[PDB]
Swiss-Prot record:
The gene is lip. Ca(2+) binds at residues 242, 288, 292, 296. Belongs to the AB hydrolase superfamily. Pseudomonas lipase family. The active site is at residues 87, 264, 286. It comes from Burkholderia cepacia. Its main location: secreted. This is Triacylglycerol lipase. Monomer. It is an enzyme of class 3 (hydrolase). GO terms for cellular component: extracellular region.
Length: 320
């Protein structure tokens, strides 16, 4: 079945925060996903945008993605593209679908903070505790450099503070006011919207899924513990071979303590709902979603590469 993932329109993978197409030009963001899709017949491109920036704005990643979609179409002769974004990438995809509706056939978001992340609120609140404010300046300086350093093309358009702000729950509400979508439920409802939207007379298939590895367990003294359901308790090799495993269980404990409920360490189930929700049950943390830390995942986590491949075929069967 070499035409299994052969969609009519090219697939464009869109990375999230800190991303690029290849870290330091060496490590692929979407680990092993592009080769797999291609060996099953797909025409796939991986966008390379600013790892730190807001999505809208003249200098934003949205404008960057639009320019890339256009060069992908001109290069291939295709008329539309299928947009598949992870994390903040899903927000960038929504920008293009709203701004150039004729050029998009579908939008799929994987663990996307459509309503922002409680963890971002947390980080912003912490930064805001310095009465001198130097903390922001120094930390930002350091993150922007890390951006320029790791970007495949050493993109200098990095703004750590703009990116942090845009992932907060307050900011994400304004974004949704600004770029509505029939795929979103009412703000505050923790419900999805419709499975499709018709903008400019152009129809888009909308899809989403989220990982909910981090589940709250018990609460005492107003303190709530959480468990990482992706792994076998204490003993899982992924706790050892992939340092993001324990790190996201920790950031995930902060969120559960900020009232976010199930999450993947950085995005709650409620914030991730969009269009046709295929599943919110995956036992994945935020990086398991893109087969991350060199394809390492807990014993209970589903194979993210198989999930993405199956979706490419679902797109094909839907006619896009
Ligand atoms: Ca992992």
């Amino acid at each position: 079945a070499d035409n299994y993932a052969a969609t009519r329109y090219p697939i464009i993978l869109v990375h999230g925060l800190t991303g690029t197409d290849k870290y330091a030009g060496v490590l692929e963001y979407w680990y092993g996903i592009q080769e797999d899709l291609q060996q099953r017949g797909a025409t796939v491109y991986v966008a390379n945008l600013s790892g730190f920036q807001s999505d809208d704005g003249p200098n934003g990643r949205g404008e960057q993605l639009l320019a890339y979609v256009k060069t992908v179409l001109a290069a291939t002769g295709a008329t539309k593209v299928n947009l598949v974004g992870h994390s903040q990438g899903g927000l960038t995809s929504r920008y293009v679908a709203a701004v150039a509706p004729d050029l998009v056939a579908s939008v799929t978001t994987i663990g996307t903070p459509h309503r922002g992340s409680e963890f971002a609120d947390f980080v912003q609140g912490v930064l805001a505790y310095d009465p001198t404010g130097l903390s922001s300046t120094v930390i930002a300086a350091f993150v922007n450099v890390f951006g320029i350093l790791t970007s495949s093309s050493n993109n200098t358009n990095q703004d750590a503070l703009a990116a942090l702000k845009t992932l907060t729950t307050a900011q994400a509400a304004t974004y949704n006011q600004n770029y509505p979508s029939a795929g979103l439920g009412a703000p505050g409802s923790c419900q999805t919207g419709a499975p499709t939207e018709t903008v400019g007379g152009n129809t888009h298939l909308l899809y989403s899924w989220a990982g909910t590895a981090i589940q709250p367990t018990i609460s005492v003294f107003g303190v709530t513990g959480a468990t990482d359901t992706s792994t076998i308790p204490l003993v899982d090799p992924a706790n050892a071979l992939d340092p993001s495993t324990l790190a996201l269980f920790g950031t995930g404990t902060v969120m559960v303590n900020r009232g976010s409920g199930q999450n993947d360490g950085v995005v709650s189930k409620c914030s991730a709902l969009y269009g046709q929700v295929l599943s919110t049950s995956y036992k994945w943390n935020h990086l398991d979603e893109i087969n991350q830390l060199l394809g390492v995942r807990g014993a209970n986590a589903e194979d993210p590469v198989a999930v993405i491949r199956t979706h490419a075929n679902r797109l094909k069967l839907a006619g896009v």
